[PDB]
Write a protein that binds this ligand. Structure first.
Ligand code: MJD
Lengths: 99, 99
């Protein structure tokens, strides 16, 4: 699809057998999801944003369906206020900005 | 232009007579710039993001040139780690996501 930006660019994702909404976020390098149950091993990480830093769990080679498109990559899980799809996954679904 | 997302979507802006780089950020509702000298009245505001909240100065009807396109709107100035162009200005320059 083409998505205009009059409203937040929210999409449906499926990850770890669960359905969620997430924000298509060109300002995010990495993908950050709110606390959820994901299987397997993970590595501690801290990431920074507008108000300071959070500790996240890093999960690698995680399958995610983003608006009907499949991608595999790194997902960070932790206290983000909103689920964020970052450029690591936006590049895999062929997402571009146009003006 | 069309912009792919293999690198951060940085653009040149001109604001308050000054040249800066800023991130085209679909995950940002509002436009947040690092401390800079802007003329005129402003209103205190606090905004939230991944790591907590910052206090910003809100400036209204501010002219900004974003990659050659002119827009007028609200700009928040404060301790953001990076200059962010949010949807309030992305809608004015006709910016869309496509996949
Ligand atoms: C500051 C930006 C450069 C990076 N951020 C992405 C930005 O799009 C971020 C996404 C976001 C986070 C959040 F907690 C709540 C939201 F509603 C929206 N937006 C953001 O700070 O915007 C703030 C401000 C903008 O106006 C309004 O719209 C949303 C609120 C609010 C104030 S980030 O902090 O969430 C972020 C996300 C993914 C990242 N991956 C990394 N990876 C490496 C570099 C560590 O860093 C990340 C940093």
């Amino acid at each position: 699809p083409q998505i205009t930006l009059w409203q937040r660019p929210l999409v449906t994702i499926k990850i770890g057998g669960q359905l969620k909404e997430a924000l298509l976020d060109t300002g995010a390098d990495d993908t950050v999801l709110e606390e959820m149950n994901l299987p397997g091993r993970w590595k501690p990480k801290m990431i920074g944003g507008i108000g300071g830093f959070i500790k996240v769990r890093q999960y690698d080679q995680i399958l995610i369906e983003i608006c009907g498109h499949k991608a595999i990559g790194t997902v960070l899980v932790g206290p983000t206020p909103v689920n964020i799809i970052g450029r690591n996954l936006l590049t895999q679904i062929g997402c571009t900005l146009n003006f």
